[PDB]
Amino acid sequence: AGADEERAETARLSSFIGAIAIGDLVKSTLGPKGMDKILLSSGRDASLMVTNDGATILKNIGVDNPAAKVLVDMSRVQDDEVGDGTTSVTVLAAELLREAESLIAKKIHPQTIIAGWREATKAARQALLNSAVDHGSDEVKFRQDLMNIAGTTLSSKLLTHHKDHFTKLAVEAVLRLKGSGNLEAIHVIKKLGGSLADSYLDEGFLLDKKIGVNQPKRIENAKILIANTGMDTDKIKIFGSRVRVDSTAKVAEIEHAEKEKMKEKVERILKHGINCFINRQLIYNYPEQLFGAAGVMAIEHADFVGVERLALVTGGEIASTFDHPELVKLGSCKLIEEVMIGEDKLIHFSGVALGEACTIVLRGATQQILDEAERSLHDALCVLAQTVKDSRTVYGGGCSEMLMAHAVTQLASRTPGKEAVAMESYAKALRMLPTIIADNAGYDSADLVAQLRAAHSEGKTTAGLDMKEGTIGDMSVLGITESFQVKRQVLLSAAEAAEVILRVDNIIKAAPR
Amino acid sequence: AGADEERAETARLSSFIGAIAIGDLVKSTLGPKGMDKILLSSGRDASLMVTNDGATILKNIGVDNPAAKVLVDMSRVQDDEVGDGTTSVTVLAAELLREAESLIAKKIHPQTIIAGWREATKAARQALLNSAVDHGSDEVKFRQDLMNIAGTTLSSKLLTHHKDHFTKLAVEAVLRLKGSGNLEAIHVIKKLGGSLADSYLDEGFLLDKKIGVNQPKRIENAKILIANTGMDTDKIKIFGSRVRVDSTAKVAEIEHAEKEKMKEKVERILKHGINCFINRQLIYNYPEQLFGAAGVMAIEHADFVGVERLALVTGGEIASTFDHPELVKLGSCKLIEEVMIGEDKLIHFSGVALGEACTIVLRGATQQILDEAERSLHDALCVLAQTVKDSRTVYGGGCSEMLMAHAVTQLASRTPGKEAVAMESYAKALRMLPTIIADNAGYDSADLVAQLRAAHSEGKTTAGLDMKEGTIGDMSVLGITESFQVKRQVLLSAAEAAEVILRVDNIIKAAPR
Amino acid sequence: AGADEERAETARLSSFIGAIAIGDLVKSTLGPKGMDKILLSSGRDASLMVTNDGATILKNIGVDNPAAKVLVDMSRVQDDEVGDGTTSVTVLAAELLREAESLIAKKIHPQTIIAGWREATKAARQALLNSAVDHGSDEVKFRQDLMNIAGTTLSSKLLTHHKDHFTKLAVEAVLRLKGSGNLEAIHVIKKLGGSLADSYLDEGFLLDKKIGVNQPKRIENAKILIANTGMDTDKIKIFGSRVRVDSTAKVAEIEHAEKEKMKEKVERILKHGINCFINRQLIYNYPEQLFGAAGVMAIEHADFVGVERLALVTGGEIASTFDHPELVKLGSCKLIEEVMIGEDKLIHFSGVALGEACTIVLRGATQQILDEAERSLHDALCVLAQTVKDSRTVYGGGCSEMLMAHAVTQLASRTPGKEAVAMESYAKALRMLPTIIADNAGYDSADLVAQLRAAHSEGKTTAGLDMKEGTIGDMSVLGITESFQVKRQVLLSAAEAAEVILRVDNIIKAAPR
């Protein structure tokens, strides 16, 4: 009724099962005709979170007892190195487990076979030199700014009609970013409005919060205040306890003390000419009445992540206790206002003196699938930063993968004894990628594999898998390219996570009913 | 239609389970290091009989519901006109069923994969033409007549402690048989009465019948008479009983006439010199008295199979009515006599002018184990005969199989569409065979599998698995060669037998009659 | 009723089963080709733990009803004295139980046999120096410093791919360590930055903290201050009374008092020229503003363990209240600076006058698998300190083990009576160790045993088992060696464990449910 009970060879199967379950969900995602899945959970989860990107969803949740979470964690380091485009690295590791059925048939030492991963070490190198043509991306780049790799990341995604334009916008963002800054202070949010452009570029920062129903609608020549400590006051670290006293006047004094906090906030707020107050946490009610009459707009529970970027942008400030206003606070001033984007209320910070950090605001159809824009968008910013830095790329659509696969078949026969079995199993691992790209396309996977191998074997590097075509075609015309870095790291990365899987095999549970 | 309804999965599976059960028992059976197996059962049993030959035991027993019995039955047709040597035909068909679990992962159309079988046949011939297949067997051949393939057949067999000598004798029989065409006239009977040699070779045919206690014991310059019709005269095919005559004048017509059948037989017999009479059926008492006085030895209800084999040997005749003597009859005239070999009196036919066929005539230490030799004898008979008809042979010890395996791996890369997928799986399967030959040796499979592969790759078709060596060596020095027919039929048969169950539509009842 | 009550012959068997189950898991953890295992448990466990070291996992959990937990507990006392090496003591004790089946056959008195153990001490003595040690270990040394025993300690460990290189590094650490006082002046930390080398050796102590963003980055002619008390001032644990404030006006008197703490710290600080301040606990903010203007770099919440190490290194200091500066404090004069390491911020202390203590920094990819490296360093530091001081070692790879067995077999036969039966069995047990080392290698154990014996018999102490080779070779070229302490202690410790199980007829427990 529950049984379980796994030993030695069946123990191995638990490693096997984890790989097959993950592969089916992720396979649909890779390629232009991608698929969207929604996940719901309760208990510290609100509802219906859907992620197209395989890396974000696996990383967030550790659903069950079988081991697989450690493999998932590793993908993020890859993400940091370069990461994305389409999520293909996890699938490659999963298929490597299928050969292990063969290993029981081999019936000698499975660890000797482990030499195959070491063998894979220069297999990676073989693909590091012979693959694609397309290098540098000089600087700023007129035409070559995009209409390339960001588009390929998008090609897998289904929003690529209007969206390819959005992608084009993202490289403009990286050009300003470019410098000794590295990769910081860029935030982009979607909006429920409908426009052909579906996106806008903001010179400053965008936030979605309001002081309350009352307060002036707009502020000019605004001063910005950011406070680490909340407006709420009464419970310090040690209470001073709960006490009685004994007079008909003393209980009144504590209420009076509250007024003093109110007094400091208004009198010095006015000297500064403060137009907006932003605090990352809860805000005490008393000051709120004060802000409305004064003509000062404040934000309750503003997110910290938005605040830190904003600080670099406005010159920053020293966020301490109420002494915080005046000189210790740097306030840039152009326009802070709630702007009618089209459908909803937003607050715009703009005209930043620094210029180092800028914000992009997206507009879309609406309903969690517009979150798709965040999904594509997250991928867009990161890909570009290394495309310029790496100074080289390889052909996409699996063109790179089939070529290496043809080369590795030769290698297995060449290695003596034990090694040839191990090396050849690694070699067909490359074969599934063409199959995965074709499968989500809906075209028949079996036919696709055979036709593909003949074109790569012939000697044309440009030729690859064309999903729209339903056969093979010229990758370069499409503009699909993969970062050279994604290929170097993935080959090194797949082996180490997969290797962990063979070395485990034993999971222990005790007894019946 | 009969019943037993199945379609996709949990249909495919029943065939899958039947194949796995057969493979483990037959596995230890193959080559030099084979083993004898004993089974315990009730019914017309009550004892354990050891059958080394897989085909003999399978025909005898039909233990359970799943259907593998029909697959089993087929091996016998092969056995009668080629068959044996080592049991691999059943194992080769069984191993391809395993890929089906891999196939569910492929998840499309089993039949699309099936296109591989036509190619497997086209490729198999391509592979058959792509192998060295030895170069020797000059014709007759002074030493490599045997000590090669028959020895391997006997090797699995228990009797090989002294029987390997018996195997050597069998090739002598085939060389004389060789000539334009037919297999016929090979039959052997074992005799109780041990000798170190364990066999005596008769130049003619061995039979076990006698005319009666009376008659000349030995006949010289013998003429042989064969009759389709028996010597019994009175009844056409209606008994009419012995009866009583319905008049004094009608008794005379039948009984006097009976004397005439006697008289016709005597006058024709004396002129010919007829020393022996062989008739396929019942024989009348009246002639029997005459044969003793005449000096002619006759055989009652002689078996037809012995007679037909005998006809090539004696030149044959047209077996009509009693007119049959003289020119219409052709009888060889060297030596016919009844010889007591040592127990179970036998009759020896000797002196075949044609030379085309002989009876061998085995004998031994007198054990039921001795009758085991009768079973292993059969294996020697058809593998060798094919060798004379084909004028072709292949290198043994898996030399042919490893070479073919290396050649086939590159072939899959060469092909497109249907061809690429089906062909590589086929190529991979050849790899397991080297492993089984090495494993039964007792040496470690791992060291053996590619050390072997390197040798074949170089181009030495002679080099192969040397079981006695424990590693790899020169097969040609060993002299082991396999006939061309055993290799073409096994490969063609394996693919289709496998194919029929997957495609399967019914295969319903166990019912004969 | 049911139950599981055991007496005499039956009671012995439960002890027997526990020993066999443990040996199979531990056998794979011996020599260069050892395997890592991971265990998952629930009820009072966090996440899966992988323990290469047999001792750590066995101590942590008592999984089931059979008795073996107590046998396990003893190995830890050994670990303190010398410990680790490679786990093998448990294996040797377990195999001694197999001879017990033989013992029933002996059928006299099981404790009579205990005499053989006394002989075992004599036999152990015979092989404690007769073949003749290792040579050199002069102190400091060149080539023989590593690629020896540390490699062997790590041999059992999977991490030994990149890791064996780490092991090589450790002897360099012991060379500085050797001197007037054991282990306690060495600090090791792992990093989140990946590199193939995976480690660096620092001339001084390594820390990972910064004052904040301000203050000078680099200091010269540096002076170091360490405090056992925080810079925090106010409450103490008796407030100086419970006092209320009418409004935040009179508490200002208290604020002025705070400034006194500020000035005392600066006055003492400037005269010294104070380059860097390190405090083990929380730090008060007022001081911090002061340090930046002065040009002094301070460290907040630096760990105490690091500080103790630093004191021996810098001549030390007496840590007390703010009278701490000047003469009670001693500071090293070379170089303190913050140097970027990988993806983390680190501060390097260097140029220590003492020279006695140094620090090694490890990096690695970024996974809890990586945290494996710290598990290994601790076993690395202890073994080496012992290896130089004991000035005696024996050849590894089982070289010593076969050799002792050859000498002991003769001893049994030479002795005339009762003593000989007991003594011979002990000699037999040594045979399994060569077999166990070979079995985890994936090579045939039987072939390995005889080939091994022939090389040892010759008289070459340098010869031994090479798993990578698959046969026998020169251990010395590899450099693998075992420390002297493990061999003397194993021989006497093993005898005590075997003796207790044989002697106990009656346990009396229960508990299954």
Determine phi and psi for C139, rounding to 5 degrees: 120, 120
**Chain B CB within 8 Å of residue A17 CB:** no
Interface membership of C444 toward B (CB under 8 Å)? yes
Contact yes or no for B421 and A449 at CB 8 A: yes
For B424, residues 6+ apart whose C-beta sits below 8 A from its C-beta are B409, B412
SS3 at position B40:
coil
Q: Contact, A245 vs A385, CB < 8 A?
A: no
Residues 6+ apart with CB under 8 A from A81: A485, A489
Rounded Cα–Cα distance for residues B35 and C501 (Å): 43
Assigned token pair, A407: 């080369």
Angle between helices A399-414 and A418-441 (to 10 degrees): 160
Spell out which residues of chain A touch residue B447, defining contact as CB-CB under 8 Å: 417-418
Helix axes B368-390, B484-503, angle to 10 degrees: 100
Strand partners of residue B393: B483
State the maximum Cα–Cα separation within chain C, in Å, rounded to a whole number: 104
The pair of structure tokens assigned to C472 is 């026998």
Give the residue from chain C lying closest to B443, CA to CA: C444
| C-beta atoms of B451 and A417 within 8 A | yes
> Strand order of the sheet with strand C199-202?
C187-190, C359-362, C199-202
Flag whether C220 is marked binding.
no
User: Residue A421 and residue B101: Cβ atoms within 8 Å?
Assistant: no
3-state SS, residue A206 = strand
Chain C positions touching A67 (Cβ under 8 A) are: 40, 48
SS3 content of chain B, % helix, strand, coil (to 5): 45, 10, 40
Contact A451 B101 (CB under 8 A): no
Residue C105, classified by CB atoms within 10 Å of its CB into exposed (0-12), middle (13-18) or buried (19+), is: exposed
> Which residues of chain A make contact with C40, given a CB cutoff of 8 A?
67, 507-508
A445 in contact with chain B, both atoms CB, cutoff 8 A: yes
Residues forming beta bridges with residue C206, ordered by sequence position? C348
- Contact residues on chain C for B447, CB-CB shorter than 8 A: 470
What does R_g of chain B's alpha carbons equal in angstroms?
Answer: 28
Hunting for tokens 């659509």 — which residue is that?
A397
- Determine the residue among A28, A95, A409, A411 to mutate to test chain B binding: the one whose Cβ has the most chain B Cβ atoms within 10 Å: A409
Beta bridge partners of B349: B336
Q: Does C446 touch chain B (CB under 8 A)?
A: no
The owner of tokens 């590199």 is: C195
CB A231 within 8 A of CB A283: yes
Residue B413's nearest CA partner among A149, A431, C73 is A431
Put simply, whether A13 touches C (Cβ < 8 Å) is: no
Q: Which of C41, C247, C443 sits opposite A257 (nearest CB)?
A: C247
Q: Which two tokens stand for residue A73?
A: 């964690």
Q: Is the dihedral of CA B290, B292, B298, B301 positive or negative?
A: positive
Tokens of B195: 């000798």
Dihedral sign from CA coordinates of A98, A103, A109, A114: negative
- A-chain CB neighbours of B109 within 8 Å are 446
Residue A396 counted as an annotated binding residue: no
Of B464, B284, B484, B305, which is closest to residue B393 (Cα–Cα)?
B484
DSSP B190: -
Site from B444, B445, B448, B449 to mutate, C interface, most C CB atoms within 10 angstroms: B444
Q: What angle do CA A329, A333, A339 make, to 5 degrees?
A: 120
Closest Cα in chain C, distance from residue B470 (Å): 12
Check CB contact of C258 with chain B, cutoff 8 Å: no
* Chain B residues near residue C444 by CB distance under 8 angstroms: 444
Locate tokens 């517009």: which residue?
A370
- Reported as type and span, the H/E element at residue A31 is none
Distance of CA C404 to the CA centre of its chain: 28
Q: Is B112 on the interface with A (CB under 8 A)?
A: yes
Q: What is the C-alpha to C-alpha distance for residues C473 and C460, in angstroms, rounded to an integer?
A: 10
Rg (CA), chain A: 29
Quick one: which H or E segment has residue A447? helix A445-458
C-alpha to C-alpha distance for B423 and B430, rounded to whole angstroms: 11
| Residues belonging to chain B | 513
C-chain CB neighbours of A500 within 8 Å are: 369
- The closest of A240, A275, A267, A276 to A322, measured between CA atoms, is A267
Secondary structure (DSSP) of C365-384 = SSSTTTTHHHHHHHHHHHHH
Q: Do A449 and B102 touch (CB under 8 A)?
A: no
Tokens representing residue A60 in the block: 């967030």
Contact A70 C33 (CB under 8 A): no
C-chain residue closest to B447, CA distance: C443
Which chain A residues are within 8 Å of C49, Cβ to Cβ? none
What is the distance between the alpha carbons of residues A475 and A468, in angstroms, rounded to a whole number? Answer: 12
B356 vs B358: CA distance, rounded Å = 7
Report the alpha-carbon distance of residue C307 to residue C124 in Å, rounded: 46
State yes or no: C119 annotated in a binding site.
Answer: no
Which residue in B408, B421, B428, B436 has the most chain A C-beta atoms within 10 A of its own C-beta, making it the best mutation to test that interface?
Answer: B421
Return phi, psi of residue B381, to 5°: -60, -50
Is C397 assigned to a binding site?
Answer: yes
Positive or negative: CA dihedral C83, C84, C90, C93: negative
CB atoms closer than 10 angstroms to residue A135 = 11
Contact between B415 and A450 using a beta-carbon 8 Å cutoff: yes
Q: Report how far residue A264's alpha carbon sits from residue A380's, in angstroms, rounded to the nearest whole number.
A: 46
Q: How far apart are the first and last CA of chain C?
A: 14
Instruction: Indicate the pairing of strand B346-350 with strand B206-207.
Output: antiparallel
The alpha-helical segments, DSSP class H, found in B295-330 are 304-314
Which amino acid type is present at position A303?
A: D
CA end-to-end span of chain A? 9
> A498 vs chain B: nearest CA distance in angstroms?
19
Task: Name residues whose C-beta falls within 8 Å of residue C152's C-beta, 6 or more positions apart in sequence.
Answer: C31, C32, C85, C86, C396, C397, C480, C481, C482
B466 DSSP β-pair partners: B471
How many whole angstroms separate alpha carbon C100 and alpha carbon C106? 9
Sheet containing A335-340: give its strands across: A205-207, A345-350, A335-340, A218-220
- The resolution, in angstroms to one decimal, equals 10.7
Q: Would you call C64 an interface residue with chain B, using a CB distance cutoff of 8 Å?
A: no
What gap in Å lies between CA C510 and CA C513, rounded to an integer?
9
Work out the minimum CA distance from C448 to partner chain B, whole angstroms: 12
Three-state SS string across B215-279, please?
Answer: CCCEEECCCEEEECCCCCCCCCCCCCCCCCCCCCCCHHHHHHHHHHHHHHHHHHHHHHCCCEEEE
Q: What's the CA gap between C156 and C53, in Å, rounded?
A: 8
Q: Is residue A114 less than 8 Å (CB to CB) from chain C?
A: no
Please, what's the largest Cα pairwise distance for chain A? 99
| Cα–Cα distance measured from residue A424 to residue A411, given in angstroms and rounded to the nearest whole number | 8
Distance of CA A309 to the CA centre of its chain: 18
Angle at which helices B419-429 and B110-128 pack, to 10 degrees?
A: 60
Compute φ and ψ for A452, nearest 5 degrees.
-60, -45
Q: Distance from C51 to chain B by nearest Cα, in Å?
A: 30
Q: Which of B464, B461, B489 is nearest to B475 (CA)?
A: B464
- Give the pairing type, strands C224-227 and C276-279: parallel
- Cβ-based burial of A30 (10 A; exposed 0-12, middle 13-18, buried ≥19): buried
Q: A449–B113: do the CB atoms touch at under 8 Å?
A: no
A240 contacts C235? CB cut-off 8 A: no
**Contact between C398 and C137 (Cβ < 8 Å):** no
Flag if B446 and A112 touch (Cβ within 8 Å): yes
* Other C-beta atoms lying within 10 Å of the C-beta of residue C22: 20
Who contacts C238 (Cβ-Cβ below 8 Å, separation ≥6)? none
| Residue C465 and residue C448 in contact, taking contact as beta carbons nearer than 8 Å | yes
Residue B251: CB partners within 8 Å, gap ≥ 6?
A: B245
Distance CA B292, CA B217 (A): 10
**Are A374 and A187 spatial neighbours (Cβ–Cβ below 8 Å)?**
no
- Interface check for C192 against chain A (CB to CB < 8 A): the answer is no
Unique residue bearing structure tokens 């490729």: B123
Nearest-Cα residue of chain A relative to residue B448: A417
- Chain C residues whose beta carbon lies within 8 Å of the beta carbon of residue A74: 367
Residues of A in contact with C242 (CB under 8 A): 240
R_g (Cα) of chain C, nearest Å: 30
Which residues, 6 or more positions from A189, have their beta carbon under 8 angstroms from its beta carbon?
Answer: A206, A208, A361, A362, A374
Interchain contact A450–B (C-beta under 8 A) = yes
B111 and chain A in contact, CB less than 8 A: no
- Sign, CA dihedral A122-A126-A132-A133, equals positive
CA dihedral sign of residues C74, C77, C81, C83: positive
* Neighbour tally for A242: CB within 10 Å: 5
Query: A238, C235: Cβ pair inside 8 Å?
Result: yes
B454·A416 Cβ contact <8 A:
yes
A112 to chain B: which residues are within 8 Å by CB? 446
Q: Is A357 helix (H, G, I), strand (E, B) or coil?
A: coil
Residues of chain C contacting residue A238, judged by C-beta atoms under 8 Å apart: 235
Angle at C454 between CA C451 and CA C460, to 5 degrees: 115
> Is residue C469 less than 8 Å (CB to CB) from chain B?
no
Nearest to A450 among B420, B432, B446 (CB): B420
Q: Which chains touch C (3 or more CB pairs under 8 A)?
A: A, B
Give dist(CA C115, CA C117) in Å, integer.
Answer: 5
Query: Which residue is closest to C443 within chain B, CA to CA?
Result: B444
Six token digits for residue B210: 């006698």
CB A195 within 8 A of CB A379: no
Say if CB C394 and CB C487 are below 8 A apart.
yes
User: Contact, C209 vs C347, CB < 8 A?
Assistant: yes
Domains of chain B and any CATH numbers: 1-133+392-513 (1.10.560.10), 134-202+356-391 (3.30.260.10), 203-355 (3.50.7.10)
Question: Whole-angstrom Cα distance, residue B55 to residue B79?
Answer: 8
